[PDB]
Every structure is written in structure tokens, then in C-alpha cells.
């Protein structure tokens, strides 16, 4: 067992604005839940994503796999863009593979 973001590779989704959207992170982890943050790339480096009244987080576990999901409500045009989720776990930085998300 190993601590593990699962984003897989090559991730890609198109949304519409104004829909309420959705984007997971499955969290494989071995026995307390990491405290995981969503980071956007800004175009040249990634960076903490900021959540406030129509960005917010939260765990499913209505899976095989417990789900750390980012919830736009309701998702922008501004949106679009690369997204990955982290952790600093124990001592060290965990990464995901980015989701890109385009907004039609």
C-alpha cells in the first residue's frame, strides 16, 4: 500500500458554461486520509487553486476508491484550462496527472 493520486494520464473532459461540473481525484491511500488541495496551471506553473461560493471540495466515498472531487457551481468560460490534485503526505509531495477541461 502506498499513498496514491489516481488522475489518469491523458486526462481530457469538455463542460458547458453555467453547468453545475465536476472533476475527480481518486486518493488510494493506506490508513488516515491525506488532506489533498487542487492546483490549476497558470500557464507556465501550477498553482493552488482558489475555491470560494461557486468552487468547493469535498470526499466521496460512494466508491470502491474514496474520490476527492472539485464542484463548480456553476462552471465558467474562465474555467478552462489544467487541473491536478496534491499532498503533502508524511514527508513528502504527491502529484497527480493533470484533467485538462474545456468550456464550450
Same mark, same amino acid.
Given at each position: 500500500?502506498? +499513498?496514491?493520486?489516481?488522475? *489518469?494520464?491523458?486526462? *481530457?473532459?469538455?463542460?458547458? $458554461?453555467?453547468?453545475?461540473? @465536476? ?13 489533498? $488541495?487542487?492546483? @490549476?496551471?497558470?500557464? $507556465? =506553473?501550477? +498553482? ?9 471540495? /469535498? ?13 463548480? *457551481? ?11 490534485? /496534491? $499532498?503533502?503526505?508524511?514527508?513528502? +509531495? ?6 485538462? =477541461?474545456?468550456?464550450?
Amino acid at each position: 500500500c502506498e +499513498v496514491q493520486l489516481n488522475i *489518469k494520464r491523458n486526462s *481530457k473532459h469538455s463542460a458547458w $458554461t453555467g453547468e453545475l461540473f @465536476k472533476i475527480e481525484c481518486p486518493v488510494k491511500y493506506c490508513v488516515h486520509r491525506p488532506n489533498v $488541495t487542487w492546483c @490549476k496551471h497558470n500557464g $507556465t =506553473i501550477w +498553482v493552488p487553486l482558489e475555491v470560494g461560493p461557486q468552487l468547493y471540495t /469535498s470526499w466521496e466515498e460512494n466508491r470502491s476508491v474514496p474520490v476527492f472531487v472539485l464542484h463548480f *457551481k456553476p462552471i465558467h468560460l474562465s474555467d478552462n484550462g489544467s487541473y491536478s490534485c /496534491s $499532498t503533502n503526505f508524511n514527508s513528502q +509531495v504527491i502529484n497527480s496527472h493533470s484533467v485538462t =477541461i474545456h468550456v464550450r
